[PDB]
Structure 1
Amino acid sequence: DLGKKLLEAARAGQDDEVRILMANGADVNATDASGLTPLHLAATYGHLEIVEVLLKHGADVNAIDIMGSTPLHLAALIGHLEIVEVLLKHGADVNAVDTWGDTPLHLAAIMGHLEIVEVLLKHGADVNAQDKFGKTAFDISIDNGNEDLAEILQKLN
């Protein structure tokens, strides 16, 4: 199966094998056993060109794996700024909620990705979105003592 092969290529960042595999009819929206698609994999592992190509050819920007993780969750978690911007440009849901009640804003804030937090806020990240323990990205910034993050999270108006 070419679906399995495309998942491996996008993960490893093999741009050429991604092109070749798709050309032979590989499902651009194939899923592994946990529901990750080539797009979740390229977005996690920072392959910008692969993300752009998948999106240009039918990849569902808001596909969820078994845990509710969208490609945006993963790019916000890992700190890939250009990928976050490309996903948002392609209609990524800024406020997608996974199984832990996390949104991309929670993940960028936990990981200290400040530029991504600012980008997400400008695209309408919900500042009041609570995780399974009732925490917002702001509650995280204040319980952590992260003043720089607290400042950006309050700047709204």
Structure 2
Amino acid sequence: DLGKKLLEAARAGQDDEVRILMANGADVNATDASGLTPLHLAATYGHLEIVEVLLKHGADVNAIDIMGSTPLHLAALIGHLEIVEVLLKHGADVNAVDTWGDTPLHLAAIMGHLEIVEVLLKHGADVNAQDKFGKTAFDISIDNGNEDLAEILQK
């Protein structure tokens, strides 16, 4: 089962192994038990070169796991700016919503990734998107007293 080995290589950052597995028929869109694909794992663990390779070999840039997380949600949560940009250039849905009502904008605002917040806003992230509790990214900035983030959201 090359799909299982491709999941492990994407998470571990083994570029050579990813190319080899793809060349031998490995499923680029294989999923683990929770619906995570090689693209979700490479984006979570910050392997930029693997993200680009998978995207040029049929990876679904908008795949969702069982919790509705896309690779963009994970990249924005962990704070990988360069991966966020590659995902957006390849058609990632900037306003994708997970099972908690969170968009990538919400996750980048929560974790204080201000540069990622700016990138998302420049790509059309919705400031009026509410999570399951009714909070927008601006509400989060106000409730936590993050003046730096609140200024960015007003720009």
Identify the TM-score tier after normalising by the shorter chain: over 0.9
| Cα displacement (A) at 1:29 | 0.4
Distance 1:88 1:54 in 2: 14
1:94 CA drift (Å) = 0.1
- Paired with 1:153 and 1:21, the residues of 2 have a C-alpha distance of 43
Q: Whole-Å Cα distance in 1 between the matches of residues 154 and 12 of structure 2?
A: 38
Report the TM-score when normalising by structure 1. Answer: 0.98
What TM-score do the two structures reach when normalised by structure 2? Answer: 0.99
Same amino acid, percent of matched pairs: 100
Deviation string for 1:92-120 (max 9, x for gaps)? 00000000000000000000000000000
Whole-Å separation in 1 of the counterparts to 2:154 and 2:106: 14
Moved over 2 A (4+): none
**How many residue pairs are counted as aligned between the two chains?**
155
Deviation at 1:136, TM superposition (A): 0.2
C-alpha deviations, 1:33-86, integer Å up to 9, x for none? Answer: 100000000000000000000001100000000000000000000000000000
| In 2, Cα distance between equivalents of 1:34 and 1:77 | 18
Q: Distance in 2 between matches of 1:97 and 1:154?
A: 22
**Structure 1 unaligned runs (5+)?**
none
In the TM superposition, what is the alpha-carbon distance from 1:6 to its structure 2 partner? Answer: 0.3
SS at match of 1:9: helix
* Structure 2 runs not aligned, ≥5 long: none
Q: Secondary structure at the match of 1:46?
A: coil
